[PDB]
């Protein structure tokens, strides 16, 4: 067994209606308030468009929910409604349905984001601190509301670098945390999957998102995106073990009594834990500080229970320059 160290009982202390998303009855707006303008590049199955809100002349984003089973539509809508107003959480404006096909669509605020592949190569030390701090605010918020995002990755963190705005998007994999519940491990992008997912440990919690955030921090400070670049899910764990070492991996499995897929016996090998300083080189030196490495070391831990919480991370000295300027 395992339990979240914080926010464990949030859903137990709310009404059944809060987390019982299968019972949620979405409230459909007028699809005719919105006029599609262009399809956005969001992924192989996505149908996401920029659109005009004809009622206020506002630019919006429309996400047509097609590939999904109905229970997951309710889950995403209910989660976005529960997080409405939250800090750095993408704002849901409306939920509409085609009258004829019945295909639902979610309408979101438009963020003028800079593609992460171009943005990450121009970030400075202070920019990374700032945007990581802003992302932590979103994660602390959703975790405090009893929700795990489960798909934190660069593509899901929209940054408008001119207005210094950040939004955590794509809540389609997010779920409510309940103590002792077993969750589907087929979540997250391969490169951002926590070790718990890779070894099929289902009793995970909000700390999954803190692994993913650590992966993003490492990628930014070391100019190595993604940080752990595996070729499949098995190799992904190897890539992690080549950095974190195998002894702590086997220690984690032993502690939680984790059933290890036997094909890992052949590929994991024996690896020492590498010191984080060893990933500094001439083209990332201006981004790396002892405070950054101290934080990263407390996020990228096998043992999900020993990772910092979002709030603990926000209190780390790495973020002092940001907190001071927010005063």
């Amino acid at each position: 067994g395992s339990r979240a160290r914080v926010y464990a009982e949030v859903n137990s202390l709310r009404s059944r209606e809060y987390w019982d998303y299968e019972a949620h009855v979405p409230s459909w707006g007028n699809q005719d308030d919105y006029q599609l303008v262009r399809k956005l590049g969001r992924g192989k199955y996505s149908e996401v468009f920029e659109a005009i809100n004809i009622t206020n002349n506002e630019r919006v984003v429309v996400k047509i929910l097609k590939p999904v089973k109905k229970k997951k539509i309710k889950r995403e809508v209910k989660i976005l409604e529960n997080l409405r107003g939250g800090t750095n959480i993408i704002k849901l404006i409306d939920t509409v349905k085609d009258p004829v096909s019945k295909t639902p669509a979610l309408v979101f605020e438009y963020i003028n984001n800079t593609d992460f592949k171009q943005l990450y190569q121009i970030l400075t030390d202070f920019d990374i601190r700032f945007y990581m701090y802003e992302l932590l605010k979103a994660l602390d918020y959703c975790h405090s509301k009893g929700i795990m995002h489960r798909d934190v990755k660069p593509h899901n963190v929209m940054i408008d670098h001119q207005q210094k705005k950040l939004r955590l998007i794509d809540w389609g994999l997010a779920e409510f945390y309940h103590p002792a519940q077993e969750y589907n491990v087929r979540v997250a992008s391969r490169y951002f999957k926590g070790p718990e997912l890779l070894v099929d440990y289902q009793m995970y919690d909000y700390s999954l998102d803190m692994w993913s955030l650590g992966c993003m921090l490492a990628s930014m400070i070391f100019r190595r995106e993604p940080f752990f670049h595996g070729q499949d899910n098995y190799d992904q764990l190897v890539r992690i073990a080549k950095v974190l070492g195998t002894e702590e991996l086997y220690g984690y499995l032993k502690k939680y009594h984790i059933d290890l897929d036997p094909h890992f016996n052949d590929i994991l090998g024996q690896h020492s834990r590498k010191r984080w300083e060893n990933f500094i080189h001439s083209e990332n030196r201006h981004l790396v500080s002892p405070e950054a490495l101290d934080l990263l070391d407390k996020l990228l831990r096998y043992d999900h229970q020993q990772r910092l919480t979002a709030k603990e991370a926000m209190e780390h000295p790495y973020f002092y320059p940001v907190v001071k300027e927010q005063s």
């Binding site: 007028n30 699809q31 005719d32 308030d33 919105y34 006029q35 659109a51």
Partner: peptide, 5 residues
């Protein structure tokens, strides 16, 4: 497409 086309 919502509002025509």
């Amino acid at each position: 497409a919502x509002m025509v086309p």
